[PDB]
Amino acid sequence: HMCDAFVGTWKLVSSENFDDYMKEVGVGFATRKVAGMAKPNMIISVNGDVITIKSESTFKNTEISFILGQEFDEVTADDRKVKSTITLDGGVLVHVQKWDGKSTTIKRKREDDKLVVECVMKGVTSTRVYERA
Ligand SMILES: C[C@@H](CC(=O)O)Sc1ccc(Cl)cc1
Numbered sequence: 001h002m003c004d005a006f007v008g009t010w011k012l013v014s015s016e017n018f019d020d021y022m023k024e025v026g027v028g029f030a031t032r033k034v035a036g037m038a039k040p041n042m043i044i045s046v047n048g049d050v051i052t053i054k055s056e057s058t059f060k061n062t063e064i065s066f067i068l069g070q071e072f073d074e075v076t077a078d079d080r081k082v083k084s085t086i087t088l089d090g091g092v093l094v095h096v097q098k099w100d101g102k103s104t105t106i107k108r109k110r111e112d113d114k115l116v117v118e119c120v121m122k123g124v125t126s127t128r129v130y131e132r133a
Contacts, residue, residue: 010130021126
């Protein structure tokens with residue numbers, strides 16, 4: 001019942017600072033433009049200890065499955081090959097991606113009827129708000 005309030009189908013409704021976040025991560029111009037247009041659906045499900053998070057959009061479809069605290073390999077939508085670990089910290093899903101000596105953290109939180117996604121790379125944050133589909 002660890003992630004009960006996260007489970008479901010969620011649609012992106014607002015974004016702030018995402019272009020700058022992608023620049024900080026190292027995403028190139030054309031990918032930033034096309035990725036920034038996308039309005040993905042994020043689909044979160046749980047089966048036993050295994051959490052699955054899918055992102056589906058016109059730009060890319062991604063899927064990760066994982067156990068909390070257990071590192072895994074991920075290919076991001078921008079084609080980074082990263083080592084990821086996802087934990088629950090005080091009811092917040094905290095997703096750290098490591099690659100090429102760099103790191104970024106993505107936090108996912110339930111706030112009112114929204115799922116808020118905060119993406120941080122160095123001093124640059126983007127906030128992406130999802131609502132139930
Ligand atoms: C958490 C991701 C954003 C989200 O799911 O709303 S971060 C990310 C996504 C796409 C690219 Cl092209 C780069 C980074």
